[PDB]
Paper text:
Here we have solved the X-ray structure of the ACD dimer of human αB R120G close to physiological pH, as well as higher-resolution αB ACD wild-type controls. Therefore, the R120G mutation site was engineered into the longer L137M construct, but for simplicity, from now on the R120G/L137M structure will be referred to as R120G. There are highly ordered methyl pentane diol (MPD) molecules bound near the β6 + 7 loops and in the side pockets, where they mimic the binding of an isoleucine in the I-X-I C-terminal motif. With an interface area of 982 Å2, the R120G has a greater interface than any of the wild-type αB structures, even when the register and β6 + 7 sheet length are considered. The change in Arg120 to Gly120 results in the loss of two positive charges along the interface. This in turn results in loss of two interface ion pairs between Arg120 and Asp109 and gain of two new interface ion pairs between His83 and Asp80. Movement of these arches toward each other to form two pairs of interchain salt bridges blocks the groove. The crystal structure of R120G ACD dimer also reveals a closed groove, but in the mutant closure is caused by a pair of salt bridges between His83 and Asp80 close to the dimer 2-fold axis. The R120G with its new set of ion pairs would favour the ACD dimer in the closed form and disturb the subunit-exchange-driven assembly dynamics.
Small Hsps (sHsps) form large oligomeric assemblies with a high capacity for holding onto nonnative proteins that are handed over to the ATP-driven chaperone machines for refolding. sHsps are ubiquitous among the kingdoms of life and within mammalian genomes occur in large families with members differentially expressed in many tissues including muscle, brain and the eye lens. Small Hsp sequences have in common an “α-crystallin domain” (ACD) of around 90 amino acids, with most having a short conserved C-terminal extension bearing an I-X-I motif and a longer variable N-terminal extension. The ACD is an immunoglobulin-like beta sandwich comprising strands β2–β9, and the assembly unit is a dimer. The conserved arginine in human sHsps is on the β6 + 7 strand at the dimer interface, not far from the dyad axis.
Residue numbers in the entry:
A (entry chain A): 67 to 151
B (entry chain B): 64 to 150
The structure:
Amino acid sequence: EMRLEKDRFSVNLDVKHFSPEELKVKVLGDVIEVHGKHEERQDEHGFISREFHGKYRIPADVDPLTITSSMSSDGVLTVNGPRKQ
Amino acid sequence: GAMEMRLEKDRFSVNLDVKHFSPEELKVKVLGDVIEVHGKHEERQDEHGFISREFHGKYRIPADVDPLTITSSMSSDGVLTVNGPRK
């Protein structure tokens, strides 16, 4: 969920079932890259693997070096940077 | 957790969180005495945004559950349940 305000630009993701250990955020050029992987090999009667990949092009008026990520209690991953004005 | 298994006296069930998936994108298969589940969701806007979401799972069916009477359902809360009565 891309969000373009006047003041900032953010990218919000629901990652409720991934711990911070299982998430990675990278920036290369003007592209934000996000990945998550969680596994529950629960015994001999079950398993589940969950995965997501995301790429988001950064607006031209946002310096890619000013980018930061964060995770909240509600289980949301945000990648954001201020817009240069 | 995104998954829980639950044994009652009348039924067996497996609950799953699949909130971000539409019914079209989900697949429930009963393979003998094993349940297999799969979902894949992709949103592309070139050349600006890409999100890809995937899950894969398998569970063993208890001996007193007939694989043939296993049904699945999807709720409005975005929850997938695979359930079968017991014998």
